[PDB]
Amino acid sequence: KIRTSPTFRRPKTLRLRRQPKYPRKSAPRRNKLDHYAIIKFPLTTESAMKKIEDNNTLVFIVDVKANKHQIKQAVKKLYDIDVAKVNTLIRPDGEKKAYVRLAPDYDALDVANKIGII
Amino acid sequence: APSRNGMILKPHFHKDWQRRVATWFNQPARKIRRRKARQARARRIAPRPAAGPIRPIVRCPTVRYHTKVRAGRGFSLEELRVAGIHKKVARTIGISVDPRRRNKSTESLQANVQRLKEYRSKLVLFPRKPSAPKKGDSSAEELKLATQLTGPVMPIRN
């Protein structure tokens, strides 16, 4: 060995991994943003029933912590349907509205009767 | 401003004295508390003198009070020696020991030695396990007749 550089450098020591003698918290926290917790209810509004009857969409009021991705897997799992796209807005009231456009092999107006909105 | 002939007088009331006015509405509540804590102490020491351990005969210092006699902190180590009581055993049979007390005189010494002789005679000593008495204790007929002494034990009258 000769010092190639005129700088001394902190030599790269071995740093180990966490192998703890106990987990800090006893249980892994249960998911509280479920499929049921995320989707609260559908809007049965003049504006939102036309949105069903024209654009082949469903309109849901949704948990404000939700992605478009979480809404897509939620709308799928609860209503055995598949989603083309989800648009979301947070209302002035403060709750997140989801405009869940459905894939063209499913009628929105024939699944809106199945969930029970008219 | 002074009116006429009156006393020249200087009240100490120039500091914010009203923040630190100690009132004594506690007084009767204090006395009830001290008396309950004194009765509660006396009940805990079932046979033992309620007042606490014997104190020595002690002359008051400075010429004003040296005609008087008061109770001391505790017996001198040389007052205990002549009496023939081990200084660590004395405290267990209720005898005040302070190792700070000298003895300049033989009269003060011999008064406090004779004081401890009187105590060691009167004192009824209960066995440690009560069910079996051993050699260095008081007899069982005396143990039944052993009950508290109220006020200072062998009170030091002038």
Added chain:
Amino acid sequence: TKGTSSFGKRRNKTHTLCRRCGSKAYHLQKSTCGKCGYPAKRKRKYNWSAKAKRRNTTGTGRMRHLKIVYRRFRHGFREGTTPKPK
């Protein structure tokens, strides 16, 4: 033009909502809460405003932990026991 005309130009805020004390006192440029001093670890409280203290003390809020401590105290802080069943 120091009064009425000059009040028109007031259209950009110095304070916003502090995120310890909730008060509209978090100075955007200084980045300090005028009420609680947020980036400072300790609460900004002064003994010269006894009124300002008692607005924001232990009474004020819920005491959601500290109210049950008072309830849990009066049974010697007992743990892992249940009342005897039916």
Added chain:
Amino acid sequence: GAYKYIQELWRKKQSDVMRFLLRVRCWQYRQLSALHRAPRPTRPDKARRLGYKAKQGYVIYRIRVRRGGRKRPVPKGATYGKPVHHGVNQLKFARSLQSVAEERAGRHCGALRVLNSYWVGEDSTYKFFEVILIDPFHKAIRRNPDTQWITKPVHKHREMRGLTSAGRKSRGLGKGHKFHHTIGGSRRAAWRRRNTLQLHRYR
């Protein structure tokens, strides 16, 4: 025992032997940071006296305190008052530099508890002190009946309340005719008793 030879050697500080040692160390210490851990007591002997034992959970921090008096922190020497309080330069701090050392150690090491401290050197600009610190939660200290008094919450931050030997020296407590002004717990307790009207219910 060696410790008496180490004791009386440390009392000859003007001797060629100790002048060399106190200068080569007081050099060494300047080139380190103002608050760093010493791996052992620089004076094992002195630390023995002050209660340091050589067991796990006894810590020793060499902390330097910048030296001199205390000039009044007032903008441009303007104390806006009466000529009594015009003083700004020749003013002195009520606590010794050793007590200021113990509490820079004790504050930084918020978990540890300052037992005591000893001098180890002075440059004109810096005094150097070793501070003896104890872990109240190490089982060596926590299971020793001799040392499980520091493991009780009454003795948190002794350095901040003048309860270490160096802090007690600032308080002017002690028995007798010279220490009347601190009769009672302290200087404040003395003042309190004397500046209270006892207004008895009857009087």
Added chain:
Amino acid sequence: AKIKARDLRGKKKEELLKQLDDLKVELSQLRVAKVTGGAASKLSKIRVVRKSIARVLTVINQTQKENLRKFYKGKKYKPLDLRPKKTRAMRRRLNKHEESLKTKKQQRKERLYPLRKYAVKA
């Protein structure tokens, strides 16, 4: 069906999560009934279902933590959840054993010079 927390406890793990979703769907259908605008008889039921979800989720969580503190019983290191939470300062105190420790020197005082039961004549 009136769900009580006595005929939940004996039951199985996946048997209770079946009943949980059996209530979750029941609640989601009542929240649709609330918005479609009818059935006062169903808007009373929404609270009854909300509490019976809480009953099941409690008994789910009760039986987990009865099983974890049985698992961590013998061990020297149990999680911060299972350790006795009282006051902070009360956890920092000396153990029931550590307060009880005397020095050899003090055990010798206690043996030689025990405080005697005595009583003096007047």
Added chain:
Amino acid sequence: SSHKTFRIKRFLAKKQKQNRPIPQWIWMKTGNKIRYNSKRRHWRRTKLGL
């Protein structure tokens, strides 16, 4: 403004929902004292802070 932070829009959301009059069955309660909502807030009159 039109450009808002999410934090302010949640503040403005709560203030909207507080700005509704009392239900007409609240004053039929046994120990009723409330006549009307005193903590109502019009957008000209009281300017909600900020």
Added chain:
RNA sequence: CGCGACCUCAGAUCAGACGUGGCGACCCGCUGAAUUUAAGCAUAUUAGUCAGCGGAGGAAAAGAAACUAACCAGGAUUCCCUCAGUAACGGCGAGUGAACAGGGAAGAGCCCAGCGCCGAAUCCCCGCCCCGCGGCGGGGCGCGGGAAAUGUGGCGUACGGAAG
């Protein structure tokens, strides 16, 4: 050049702990004014007080004499009564201002280092087994690890102590 020590000082999301912040009536440590009073005013006074900073506890602090005394002597601290508006301080002005003894409330004493003796006689942590505790403690088992002769434990501390 290499390898084994040791010292001194780094890095870890290393194993296990610990501190911070709050309240702040009471308590400890600092810091520290000016209104005011002196018929002005500067020293003094207000006042080591308000504000400022730090640290606690169920109380705190203090505390078992480097004491008070000058006696025929008392004997830790704290608190109450009294000493006492006293001795003393002070533009000796305004004002300030304790202590001892004495009576009581309470009453409790102690431990190191050093000095020296005993084969480090000491302590910490991991693994196993058996009790076993929501105050991790007890008993086994291991050329299991570590701290510690740069001094751990027992005896012993001024009231003297130790050895035979």
